[PDB]
Design a binder for this molecule. Structure first.
Ligand SMILES: *[C@@H](C)[C@H]1/C(=C/c2[nH]c(/C=C3N=C(/C=C4\NC(=O)C(CC)=C4C)C(C)=C\3CCC(=O)O)c(CCC(=O)O)c2C)NC(=O)[C@@H]1C
Ligand SMILES: *[C@@H](C)[C@H]1/C(=C/c2[nH]c(/C=C3N=C(/C=C4\NC(=O)C(CC)=C4C)C(C)=C\3CCC(=O)O)c(CCC(=O)O)c2C)NC(=O)[C@@H]1C
Ligand SMILES: *[C@H](C)[C@H]1/C(=C/c2[nH]c(/C=C3N=C(/C=C4\NC(=O)C(CC)=C4C)C(C)=C\3CCC(=O)O)c(CCC(=O)O)c2C)NC(=O)[C@@H]1C
Ligand SMILES: *[C@H](C)[C@H]1/C(=C/c2[nH]c(/C=C3N=C(/C=C4\NC(=O)C(CC)=C4C)C(C)=C\3CCC(=O)O)c(CCC(=O)O)c2C)NC(=O)[C@@H]1C
Ligand SMILES: *[C@H](C)[C@H]1/C(=C/c2[nH]c(/C=C3N=C(/C=C4\NC(=O)C(CC)=C4C)C(C)=C\3CCC(=O)O)c(CCC(=O)O)c2C)NC(=O)[C@@H]1C
Ligand SMILES: *[C@H](C)[C@H]1/C(=C/c2[nH]c(/C=C3N=C(/C=C4\NC(=O)C(CC)=C4C)C(C)=C\3CCC(=O)O)c(CCC(=O)O)c2C)NC(=O)[C@@H]1C
Ligand SMILES: *[C@H](C)[C@H]1/C(=C/c2[nH]c(/C=C3N=C(/C=C4\NC(=O)C(CC)=C4C)C(C)=C\3CCC(=O)O)c(CCC(=O)O)c2C)NC(=O)[C@@H]1C
Ligand SMILES: *[C@H](C)[C@H]1/C(=C/c2[nH]c(/C=C3N=C(/C=C4\NC(=O)C(CC)=C4C)C(C)=C\3CCC(=O)O)c(CCC(=O)O)c2C)NC(=O)[C@@H]1C
Ligand SMILES: *[C@H](C)[C@H]1/C(=C/c2[nH]c(/C=C3N=C(/C=C4\NC(=O)C(CC)=C4C)C(C)=C\3CCC(=O)O)c(CCC(=O)O)c2C)NC(=O)[C@@H]1C
Ligand SMILES: *[C@H](C)[C@H]1/C(=C/c2[nH]c(/C=C3N=C(/C=C4\NC(=O)C(CC)=C4C)C(C)=C\3CCC(=O)O)c(CCC(=O)O)c2C)NC(=O)[C@@H]1C
Lengths: 36, 67, 641, 160, 160, 161, 161, 161
């Protein structure tokens, strides 16, 4: 009977990843690969 | 209130371009007198073909007592 | 820039169809509980869910191998897997070096994306996502991607994916069916866009990609036909009532016109004639004509009869003329007999709300149509289409930068703002950071600080408000009958009436501040600062309001004028964000303009009005001057006398 | 039936039945055997159900079988039992169809104005259907009794 | 023609055509000699125009005639040549009429629907029309080519 | 509608062939007559109400049609008859400018005859009013355009009858 | 409309009889063949466009119907005709799933023949195209479902003719 | 509207990732609770009238709300209020079956305050009545299914505040 609980049940946290520099920074990425 | 009973076929002219669902275009219906002029003009402006029209409600040549 | 806004509400088009959404929307669009049909679909889908999740798990685990098999069959002369982000007669393998790194990346990405969306479709129980995003992908990628090559890759992925499912004809059949749908849809040519031509020259023509329509929720369409079963005719009539009256008033209140329903279900009248006569009925008249001015009534009528809001200034103009001439019957006849109505609904189809997802939408009436389609549309009385359309063609209004709701009534006391939800009247306008609101000086016009910035503080005399100053000496700066007690107390009560609008009840006055002012220990400015920062002011005028409403009322009370625009509003609002209420009060009373207009000995007072406030005061019959806004004829005795 | 409702909604959207709709109808067809078994159980003992439910109704609502009552007398009581049998037959129709479409079409659409024109108290008819549901539940298994009770309760709800 | 367009616009507003509409009608009815000579010049040179266009297209898309291609096979190839000729005829119709109506009512509305059902790629068709435009305008004077180009452009725009 | 130019184009298209010289002569003839047609249309437009009043006076006023018992009796029916004549003149002008009678067969003679029969509108009197309209417009426009407009007014008349 | 099960329910209701053996066995028969109906409808849906393409290819194309003067000439006519065929296939699928032809009469064959006669759509070639659809679907879904669908396609054809 | 599957799929897709473990965990929880949620929805549908009757009796009847001057006084207002209660029950059922409150956001709470503040419906009385509906449903469906429906009824209630 308790199996009905989905919204009333224990929440199942979902993974959402922090966004990172997209391809629009490619040139700067290259500059970062040549700044060390 | 006088009423015309009209039978007409009014194919859609925009169905191909809109992609809206097919509808039955051949119909018989009662239209009030007060709207029959506009309705007839609309049907003929659609490319429609009016098949039959009769005075369902009312009497020809009545001067008083229309509604 | 644009001079008006129709409002903007969050729009949620359906990206793809899922089984629960399908069933629940099927029940919800008909205004009923889920019945055996939809509940059974839900039961079967939930039962299959475990198997579907097994398929998804196995495919996501082995997605690498499946994509690798595809990439190896399709490409020749190298390793496609160096960077990962039945046979058509024309198929030939593609060279990695020749084909290029960018296009190789897109090939691998597309294969993985196909597999990913296939797993999505498996889980959703509907291939709609695949169809939506794959019908017409061919023509999108023909010129840089080989169609035969893509077909062979998809066939290889299909075979590899189904290879993991020798279990029985449960997992294998589902995988094969979804991959077959993907294959046939990638092979599909691009369908033509759905064109929504302008019904007249004042409305633009538009088109919508068929994929957009396929994703969005499908509008259920009811058509009255003679051969329908009685239950189907009942459903159609209920839909007609839901459309015309915005809800099933027959179910709710047993309200109905029985003879009209009998005529329409017999075929004596068409659904179009039924709509015409129902919209003319006293039921419709009482519900959607009598409660509204004609301007709002015609907008509601457009919703009910055409499934859309007005499209242009010309249209609202034309139909308001029609309703002015012949009232509700003329309006209904014009709408129902329009070429547009017959173009969409014809004779048999119950009108339906078109809106987003059903056809291409216009930007010009976007927000207004969003509002109109809400079930709360009957409770907006202020016209929204004529107002917004007119405001497009005109400069920015006299209005607070954050909207009309942020303008309080310019009355003696009370912070009265329009409530956003109560009788919705919002009138958004795009004021950028640099606009300056035109204010009307309470005094000589030429003393307005805009044209005469050194006029700031010039008392307005008879043309403006009374000004209270601690000009006379304070008492005890012994003996009785010292006359300096009446003036100082009159000023104290004036300060209370200025900060709070009216005098406080007994026990509320800040007595310590009053004695500390009467003893010369503080200045008038300091005392009004104490009044403004008092917990009573917080409870009355800061706490119960939207932050910017509180700030605006504060500014009017303390600086004697509304804010000019976004600069003042933004600074006070930012202080509110960072510090709080006391700091906002400090900023207003320590500002330079306060010092200029009011020294350390002047009680603040109303220095300016908005046009709306002045009109409220001076446009009433008993206050309207005879020379304002009309021709004044000089009366002379007749020459024959 | 379920097939009719699914097809009608598909027509309303001008589309083929989706895989989910094909699945709902697959389940409906598979459960056809059980629903036909339930219908057979109901029809086999219709006479006993009608008799017992009518007697219980008369016990619970004496005014109906009293002077000034709609069912007063032998003939009116006979017609009241006839209506009870009609509604049990419609319940069997609903059971076999897997949906209340036959019940709505035959017995319930315009039932309140039908019995109002006859002077029959509709609440008493709902009570008679309730007694028939009680007897039928007592006559078969619980698992079948729930499925039958769904349609019995639909009839009751359209009369209360 | 423009006369029909003017009359349609006037009837939609229930009025006689205005002065500007009639002036446009007069200008169109005066350029008829140029329209007629363009139509005739394109008529007798159908074969050369189609030959140049088709060789250019199938140089652009050898796959269409290749195995598995839509035009692979003599029947399909001849049908494609037939289509070239038919659309050139439509262009002459449009040139004579003074507007795109004869073209659009005959061979643009539903054209994607038709060719999708035949698996003839619409982008193949737009490339075909482009090469037909080039070939046909090659056989016209500069002014006539300038006059008759926008009709080809309109077919191209409708095709995709 | 369906012009003379589009009529020739439609005959060619239905045959599926290019426009031969035989059919191109019709196109040339229509192209030549543009100025006369446009002038006649402008003249008719400038005087439509006067044309209708003059025709009504010539054919209908002071007759049993407008006395008690006649369909033109009563104010509303008089106005309806005048509106019908106005539409007839406008559509005849359309057909004249087009050079084709299709618009008449499409937007005039489409259920109109049987509507009139249902309402008892006298066909002969309507035809007489259209004849008076023809005479007035011919007297106002000229002999050539007058005849070439009377062709289309006659099309309407023979459709009604 | 009504399914094959609502059909037997109605047949019993007209006599006021409970479901007897001759009705129970028909319900059993419908429930026995329901799985084949579901599968055939699924297959037809998966290949509806290709079915219509193949049917048109071997029935209408390369004939006077698609030549100038034929009712399928011009792109708009061709698109409309194939759209009609799409609708016929979908509605025959509906009737196949329901096991009854009532839906065909109430939502296909009502004004259709009148509409075609007013338009001039050739009925005979419409019937031939639908017969080609029957052939293609029969070859695609198997002999049993093919025949049980051709029943309803023929029902549509007889309604049109 | 969006159900739980759409929420999970969109979360996965916006990041370009396949359905991961947590996503699969939530999806399988949804699928496992689905059967009992469907049963609860069926029970609620079978008892909507009685649920609303008992909730009204508990919370609204015999109060200032139903007496002259109360917002539920007249028969029209009474019927409208019980109709609104039916709305809340139905849409709570939709939200439970979908496993997400998006339907409540877009189809209920959109202008719920607009409607009630404009009409002056008492918000506290509505919240009390919805709490009564939740209690009655819980007594009827079970404690756990009662909680499952109570999350959404509480969602509407908090939306009212
Ligand atoms: C004898 C008349 C019958 C009867 C009556 C009965 N009524 C109720 C309860 C209510 N009746 C009303 C009705 C109205 N309120 C209005 O404002 C209007 C219009 C002016 C009407 C007609 C209402 C609202 C109620 C609810 C109670 C409340 O006041 O809050 C009852 C009680 C039912 C119960 O079980 O509680 C009864 C007994 N009952 C009969 O059997 C007679 C035929
Ligand atoms: C009992 C719940 C309380 C109460 C209710 C009450 N409501 C109205 C009027 C309306 N309620 C709505 C609400 C909705 N319509 C929808 O479609 C939905 C979305 C699913 C909702 C929430 C509407 C739109 C109306 C008016 C129009 C209509 O009938 O639909 C009234 C009547 C108010 C009047 O003065 O006429 C009442 C009485 N009132 C109470 O006192 C209870 C606490
Ligand atoms: C009762 C004495 C007999 C009887 C009646 C009956 N009639 C219908 C259906 C219709 N009746 C009408 C009549 C009217 N509709 C109107 O609006 C008006 C004008 C004011 C009239 C007179 C119509 C139009 C219908 C068809 C549509 C509708 O049902 O409303 C039925 C139902 C028929 C059906 O097949 O469903 C019945 C039963 N039947 C008898 O046996 C009695 C002798
Ligand atoms: C006349 C004394 C003054 C005046 C009037 C004026 N009004 C308009 C335009 C509109 N007036 C309305 C009015 C109403 N809408 C309603 O619903 C009702 C309630 C019954 C009323 C009275 C509307 C809707 C319009 C707009 C119409 C349209 O869409 O065009 C104008 C013209 C404005 C324009 O830009 O065309 C005028 C001139 N103007 C004066 O100067 C007088 C003092
Ligand atoms: C008394 C006969 C009735 C009554 C009165 C009542 N009024 C309020 C609140 C306010 N009254 C005003 C009025 C004015 N402000 C002005 O500037 C002017 C002209 C000088 C007037 C007349 C205002 C603005 C308010 C709100 C702000 C404030 O109260 O200070 C209330 C209290 C409402 C509340 O809770 O806010 C009351 C009770 N109420 C009755 O029942 C009598 C019929
Ligand atoms: C002169 C050509 C016409 C005219 C003018 C007139 N104006 C006023 C009063 C005001 N004028 C303004 C205007 C502005 N203030 C601004 O900040 C700006 C933006 C740069 C403008 C355009 C304002 C706001 C007022 C109100 C008083 C104030 O200055 O604060 C009057 C006096 C009206 C009165 O009743 O006192 C007059 C006479 N009047 C005409 O007849 C001329 C056609
Ligand atoms: C007198 C106060 C004014 C006036 C009148 C006038 N009328 C006509 C001609 C006609 N008048 C009518 C009107 C009616 N006929 C009806 O049957 C009714 C309905 C009850 C009405 C109102 C008609 C139809 C005519 C046309 C002739 C006819 O009836 O056969 C004329 C002569 C028209 C002419 O110029 O030849 C006149 C003089 N004229 C004025 O100046 C007065 C203000
Ligand atoms: C005038 C010369 C004669 C005459 C006319 C007359 N007609 C009506 C009523 C109608 N006339 C029409 C005609 C048309 N509708 C169209 O769309 C067009 C095509 C361009 C035409 C010509 C129609 C449809 C009606 C009925 C609807 C309506 O009137 O709005 C009347 C009135 C009839 C009545 O009983 O009210 C009259 C008087 N009558 C004569 O005697 C003249 C010979
Ligand atoms: C040639 C440039 C392209 C091409 C053509 C191609 N077309 C077909 C078959 C048909 N083409 C049509 C076309 C039309 N019908 C119309 O009404 C109009 C407007 C006047 C047009 C353009 C039709 C109807 C058919 C089929 C009819 C029939 O069979 O007679 C084919 C053959 C397809 C087949 O055999 O299945 C081909 C090859 N192919 C290319 O590659 C070019 C882009
Ligand atoms: C194709 C095999 C044949 C063909 C078809 C064709 N039909 C039309 C036009 C229409 N066909 C319909 C269809 C229906 N009406 C209904 O009520 C239903 C029942 C579900 C259907 C299927 C309609 C409504 C039209 C009118 C257009 C519209 O969409 O509204 C045409 C076009 C005719 C024209 O002149 O444009 C054609 C070509 N023609 C053939 O030659 C084939 C044998």
């Amino acid at each position: 009977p308790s199996q009905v609980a989905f919204a009333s049940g224990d929440p199942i946290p979902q993974n959402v990843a922090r966004r990172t520099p997209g391809p629009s920074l490619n040139r700067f990425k290259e500059m970062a690969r040549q700044v060390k | 209130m006088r009423m015309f009973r009209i039978t007409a076929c009014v194919p859609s002219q925009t169905r191909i371009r809109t992609q809206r669902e097919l509808q039955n275009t051949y119909f018989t219906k009662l239209v009030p007198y007060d709207n029959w002029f506009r309705e007839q003009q609309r049907i003929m402006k659609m490319g429609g073909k009016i098949v039959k029209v009769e005075l369902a409600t009312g009497r020809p040549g009545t001067n008083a007592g229309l509604a | 820039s644009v001079k008006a806004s129709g409002g903007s509400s969050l729009a949620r088009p359906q990206l793809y169809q899922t089984v629960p959404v399908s069933a629940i929307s099927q029940a919800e669009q008909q205004d009923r509980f889920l019945e055996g049909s939809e509940l059974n679909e839900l039961t079967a889908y939930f039962q299959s869910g475990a198997l579907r999740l097994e398929i998804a798990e196995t495919l996501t685990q082995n997605a690498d191998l499946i994509v690798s098999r595809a990439a190896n069959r399709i490409f020749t002369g190298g390793s496609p897997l160096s960077y990962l982000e039945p046979i058509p007669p024309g198929f030939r393998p593609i060279n990695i070096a020749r084909y290029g790194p960018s296009n190789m990346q897109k090939s691998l990405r597309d294969m993985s994306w196909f597999l990913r969306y296939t797993t999505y479709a498996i889980v959703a129980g509907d291939p709609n996502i695949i169809v939506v995003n794959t019908r017409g992908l061919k023509e999108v990628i023909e010129n840089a991607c080989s169609i035969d090559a893509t077909i062979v890759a998809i066939q290889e992925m299909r075979a590899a994916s189904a290879d993991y499912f020798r279990n029985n004809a449960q997992a294998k059949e589902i995988v094969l069916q979804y991959f077959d749908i993907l294959l046939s849809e990638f092979k599909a040519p691009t369908p033509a866009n759905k064109v929504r031509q302008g019904p007249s020259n004042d409305i633009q023509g538009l088109e919508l990609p068929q994929s957009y329509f396929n994703a969005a929720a499908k509008r259920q369409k009811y058509a009255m036909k003679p051969g329908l079963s009685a239950l189907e005719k009942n459903a159609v009539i209920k839909a007609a009532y839901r459309q015309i009256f915005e809800r099933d008033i027959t179910k709710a209140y047993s309200q109905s016109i029985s003879y009209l329903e009998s005529q329409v279900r017999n075929g004596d009248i068409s659904m179009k004639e039924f709509v015409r006569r129902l919209a003319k009925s006293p039921l419709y008249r009482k519900q959607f004509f009598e409660p509204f001015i004609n301007s709002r009534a015609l907008e509601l009528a457009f919703r009910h009869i055409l499934g859309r809001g007005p499209s242009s200034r010309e249209e609202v103009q034309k139909y308001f003329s029609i309703v002015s001439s012949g009232g509700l019957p003329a309006l209904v006849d014009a709408l129902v007999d329009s070429q547009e109505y017959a173009d969409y609904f014809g004779e048999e189809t119950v009108p339906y709300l078109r809106g987003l997802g059903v056809e291409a939408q216009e930007c010009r009436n976007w927000g207004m149509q969003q509002d109109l389609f809400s079930y709360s549309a009957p409770f907006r009385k202020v016209p929204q289409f004529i107002t917004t359309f007119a405001q497009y063609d005109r400069p920015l209004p006299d209005q607070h930068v954050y909207g009309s709701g942020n303008d309080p009534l310019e009355i003696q006391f009370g912070a009265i703002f329009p409530k956003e939800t109560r009788n919705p009247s919002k009138r958004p306008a795009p004021f950028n950071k640099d606009t300056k609101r035109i204010l009307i000086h309470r005094g000589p016009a030429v003393n307005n600080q805009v044209g005469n910035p050194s006029a700031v503080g010039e008392f307005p005399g008879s043309l403006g408000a009374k000004v209270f100053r601690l000009n006379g000496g304070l008492p005890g700066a012994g003996t009785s009958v010292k006359f300096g007690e009446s003036s100082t107390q009159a000023l104290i009560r004036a300060a209370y009436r200025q900060v709070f609008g009216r005098d406080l009840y007994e026990g509320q006055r800040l007595s310590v501040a009053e004695i500390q002012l009467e003893n010369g220990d503080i200045s008038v400015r300091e005392f009004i600062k104490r009044l403004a920062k008092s917990e009573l002011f917080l409870k009355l005028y800061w706490a119960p309001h939207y932050v910017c409403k509180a700030i605006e009322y504060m500014h009017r009370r303390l600086l004697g004028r509304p804010t000019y625009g976004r600069q003042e509003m933004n600074q006070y609002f930012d202080i509110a964000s960072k510090q709080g209420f006391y700091a906002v009060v400090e900023a207003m009373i320590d500002s330079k303009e306060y010092s200029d207009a009011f020294g350390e000995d002047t009680v603040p007072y109303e220095r300016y009005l908005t046009p709306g406030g002045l009109q409220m005061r001076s446009a009433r019959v008993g206050s309207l001057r005879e020379d304002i806004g009309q021709r004044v004829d000089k009366e002379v005795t007749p020459r024959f006398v | 039936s379920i097939v009719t409702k699914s097809i009608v909604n598909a027509d309303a959207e001008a589309r083929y039945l989706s895989p989910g709709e094909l699945d709902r109808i697959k389940a409906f067809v598979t459960g056809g055997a059980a629903r036909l078994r339930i219908a057979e159980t109901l029809t086999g003992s219709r006479e006993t159900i009608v008799k017992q439910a009518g007697d219980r109704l008369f016990q619970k609502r004496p005014d109906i079988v009293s002077p000034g009552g709609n069912a007063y007398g032998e003939e009116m009581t006979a017609t009241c039992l006839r209506d009870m049998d009609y509604y049990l037959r419609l319940v069997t129709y609903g059971v076999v169809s897997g949906d209340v479409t036959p019940i709505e079409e035959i017995g319930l659409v315009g039932v309140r104005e039908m019995y109002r024109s006859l002077g029959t108290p509709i609440e008493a008819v709902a009570q008679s259907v309730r007694e028939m549901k009680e007897v039928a539940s007592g006559l078969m298994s619980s698992d079948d009794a729930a499925e039958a009770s769904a349609y019995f309760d639909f009839v009751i709800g359209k009369m209360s | 023609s423009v006369v029909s367009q003017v009359i349609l616009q006037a009837d939609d507003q229930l009025r006689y055509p205005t002065s500007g509409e009639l002036k446009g009608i007069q200008a169109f009815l005066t350029t008829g000699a140029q329209r007629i000579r363009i139509a005739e010049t394109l008529a007798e040179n159908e074969k050369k125009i189609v030959d140049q266009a088709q060789k250019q297209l199938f140089k652009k898309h050898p796959e269409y005639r290749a195995p598995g291609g839509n035009a692979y096979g003599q029947r399909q190839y001849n049908q494609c040549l037939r289509d070239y000729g038919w659309y050139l005829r439509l262009v002459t119709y449009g040139v004579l009429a003074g507007n795109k109506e004869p073209i659009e009512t005959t061979g643009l509305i539903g054209v994607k629907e038709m060719y999708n059902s035949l698996n003839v790629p619409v982008p193949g068709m737009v490339d075909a029309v482009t090469v037909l435009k080039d070939a046909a305008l090659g056989l016209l004077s500069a002014e006539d080519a300038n006059e008759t180009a926008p009709y080809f452009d309109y077919i191209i725009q409708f095709m995709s | 509608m369906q012009d003379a130019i589009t009529a020739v184009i439609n005959s060619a298209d239905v045959q599926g062939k290019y426009l031969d010289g035989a059919a191109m002569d019709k196109l040339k003839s229509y192209f030549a007559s543009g100025e006369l047609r446009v002038r006649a249309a402008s003249v008719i437009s400038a005087n439509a109400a006067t044309i209708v009043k003059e025709a009504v006076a010539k054919s209908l006023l002071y007759s049993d049609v407008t006395r008690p018992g006649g369909n033109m009796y009563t104010t509303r029916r008089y106005a309806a008859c005048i509106r019908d004549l106005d539409y007839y003149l406008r559509y005849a002008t359309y057909a004249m400018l087009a050079g084709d009678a299709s618009i008449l067969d499409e937007r005039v003679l489409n259920g109109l005859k049987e509507t009139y029969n249902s309402l008892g509108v006298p066909i002969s009197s309507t035809v007489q009013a259209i004849q008076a309209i023809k005479e007035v417009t011919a007297s106002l426009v000229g002999a050539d355009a007058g005849k070439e407009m009377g062709v289309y007014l006659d099309y309407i008349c023979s459709g009604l009858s």
